[model samples]
Target: TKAIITHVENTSRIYLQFSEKDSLMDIICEKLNGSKLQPKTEKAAVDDMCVVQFADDLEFYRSRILEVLEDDQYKVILIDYGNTTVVDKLYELPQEFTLIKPVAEICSMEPSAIFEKNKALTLTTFDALLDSCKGVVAVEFVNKSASPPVVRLTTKDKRSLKIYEHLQKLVQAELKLIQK
Candidate 1:
């Protein structure tokens, strides 16, 4: 699944994983190194993909590592609530989306439903987030408006990346605008 990225300046959280059989909730609580804060599920606060809340404000918030039975494949999925402006997560994509066929097929992952929501600037810091992912296919940044603008990546998965690259190339080739 594609990783989602959001622009909200909320608390900075990271995921640390070990064996698939290990308890992730337990691991998250231990990693926070602080008392759990009261979860804010306020209306319009945007809590789409949240599953269970641990210690009041804690739980597998955004993404989780999903493993397949037969293939033993692992896929990281970013949950979305149909908010396009929010970039839930990022995965290093390749030039050919076919390379990740196994990652997608074996895990049976699906593209984010949020892409159907926002149209512009929905995916921010994808390049940086790609670095956070384990395997990425391509990284190509082009110049359209400014000296250096947003990069046009051709990742292993083409669901949203294809839409992004298509728009990016069209903009840069036509009116010469950045892919920001």
Candidate 2:
């Protein structure tokens, strides 16, 4: 599916919202907005994807549960926009939407420890991802079996901004830092 950038959190956590699903996204948001209902008490397990109300955001977002707390709070990644937060218990996304492909996929830039081992290099790599994922870019996965998958993003235009060449630059910078 084709996508546009939404948010860039770090090298391992860049978010791309799919172009095809914009209407479905709108439907989900509108469905919740059109109703005056709070989510029914529900049990969500780790790795469960559900519709969650983010912190005071008023709009519900699609999220993946990372950790489930006993008191009905959950640590989740609001994947479509790449925001991670703890939210109150949520209703599982309806089966209709659940059958649809995820709105976003998590992937790391082709490059990571000396880079991944320490936080600084990771931050630099994150900066590199932020730079590339902004504006518009092409998204494709390199290794299909990798957990989060490794992605390659390229700008279709010669625009100075997203011509970032995402991974290689960060990889080069990381090697330079480690070289010194």
Candidate 3:
């Protein structure tokens, strides 16, 4: 299935949204037309998407509910970026933005703890990878059957995007050091 990235939680876990006809940005623009920002309450429940004005974050990021906890709070993750924190209250949600859709999914190139264990390169590597995804449409995905879906992403030219590729290089580099 064709998809667009929503966020990369780390080198291993990435959040993506399927965009075929309307690009993710195109959909967002349409949503913003009458976005109608409204306060958060129990409305933004489990598996719901809403716009958030996080106290510590200046940018109003599109976010989704991971789960609901006590006193009208949610375990929320910023959809376009990484990181999760506890949030109980906020103001306003766009009904358009809150389309009651399955807005986010986890697509992994290769899910491994090794990348995170001996990590740092993977951090910047993914930043560049995320940056690399910035332009262009008509990208590709291989393998959609797995949840926490193990995926392969490529451009139209059919070149590999190096999910396990760069990662193995990092592992191999670390290994080469040990042998010497």
Candidate 4:
């Protein structure tokens, strides 16, 4: 069997081949889930490709996924695909790097935690609150000397523009951090 696995985050291409007896869905789930590539949801068809939504885990899976795809006879057509390119670019800047921090680490709370903290007090309807929610795309590190490190982020479309703005704010915002 043959199919294409394009990462929803970065259009990075994966052309795969398997034995005739292997189920495509099973192969994908096993291959991705077995690794650190945890998509927010399960596999679903989006036209010719099977779409899965990977979040901040993109960093964990970025290089590893490419390595696996190459070694397994799967051709990686678009090597620089997805929002990961932005993260990669940030790292490529002149600087010594540090570990990639999770959203929970930077905020000292998860995104959902922030939402839940405001569930009471009878302010607005649930739908209204949800309408303002914005999902985080990715998190990464870049440093010139690590004295005062910060986070940053991208895209080409209108939505993409907003993403870039959102990322910029996240890196610049003076949010509380998790003391380590």
Candidate 5:
């Protein structure tokens, strides 16, 4: 199915609906490394679409852009950032919205910055976690924003420490620095 972006003002979260099989969550998490988006739900929506929610609007817009770019049918046209005057007014977008870094800014970033920026888990990263999931019948993403802005994994099974440790190791491996 297609990806849809909607906002929940009460909770100040953005909900995303996309295909079930696609790794859109992983892509989004990685693309937005810092102040990462937390996956709120994964319930099946109408027409095979899966609804996922993010902690904020920034994540929502980023996911929307990625979904649009991947389609190829809709050229990005223009991303109106910073200077929001009559242009933004015409587009009906706010003058000051959560802006993702400019392409040049992201390109020129140092390796350390890049690592910090990569907030989302990739397919490979998730695969490693999946390998470590021993008794996890199914992995589900839920909403609980009280914890720190890092990735959170939860299970109903009592033997959760082992799984948590395994997940932590995978994250550490991904973040570990390589000797030059």
Candidate 6:
């Protein structure tokens, strides 16, 4: 008898974020710093060439992108939204980086809390939101780092730009919820 070989015919990429507790961000930063490198492509596996770049915040993160560095390699970037610095290299996520923070309901007026309230959130809705929204794009600017760093997001088409803007609105709504 011969054993049958099977291959994974499809691939997908996932990005995730955790909760917003004090010092948790700092802990995540440390993990990002002490991470390992992986191959970005199957071809890369043949050469042992791993491309890892760290970006602080969306600006630097946008600039430091790897194109198929290795088919099998995965990269993680950590961002300090409070400081506006995004560290692209990280090994483990913070123990307390929960993506969805439960909101405390005040009176019925706490409607915004329904969308956003406690803790910070990321664009986990991009895929679903893209279905209904249009003309969206993500834009980043350098902070007071006083250094010439790169920042930008590329849209494959106008529809993608719409999705970007929609995602941005969702983020803003969530932020306002957090503040309230």
Best by lDDT: 2
Candidate 2 TM-score to native: 0.65
Lowest summed lDDT across 10 adjacent residues in model 6 is found at 1-10
- For model 5, residues 119-148, the per-residue Cα lDDT tens digits are 454324434443444313222233334221
Question: What's model 6's TM-score?
Answer: 0.21
| Better TM-score candidate (1, 2) | 2
The prediction achieving the highest TM-score against the true structure is: 2
TM-score of each: 0.21, 0.65, 0.59, 0.17, 0.23, 0.21
Candidate 3 residues lying further than 4 Å off, grouped into runs, are 21-25, 29-36, 40-50, 54-62, 65-75, 79-89, 94-99, 111-116, 133-143, 155-161, 174-179
Q: Which portions of model 2 miss their true places by more than 4 Å?
A: 7-13, 42-44, 47-49, 79-82, 112-114, 124-135, 144-147, 155-180
Report the lDDT tens digits of candidate 4 across residue range 1-180.
Answer: 121212222111112111242353344335544543332232121111212223445422222122222222221112213222211111111111113211111111112332334333211322222133332223333442342233232222234333324432333342333222
TM-score, model 1 to reference: 0.21
lDDT, residue 33, candidate 2: 57
> For each candidate, C-alpha RMSD in Å?
17.6, 4.2, 4.8, 18.7, 17.0, 19.8
Model 3 global lDDT (CA atoms, 0 to 1): 0.60
Q: Candidate 2's residue-wise lDDT over 1-180, tens digit each?
A: 456666666656567766777887778778755655446575778898787777666777777898987677789987667768887768557665666665666766665433456556556665555555453566777876886777776654564233225444566676778887
Each model's number of backbone clashes?
17, 2, 3, 1, 3, 27
**lDDT score, candidate 2, position 136:** 59
- Per-residue CA lDDT of model 1 for 1-180, tens digit only, reads 232222222111212121331344333434433333333233221222222222333333332334222342223343321112222232222233222211111111113333223323333433343444342434333443432233333444543344344534433443334433
lDDT of 5: 0.29
State in Å the error of residue 24, model 5: 24
Judging by lDDT, tell me the better candidate of 4 and 5.
5
The TM-score, computed over Cα atoms with residue i paired to residue i, of candidate 4 is 0.17
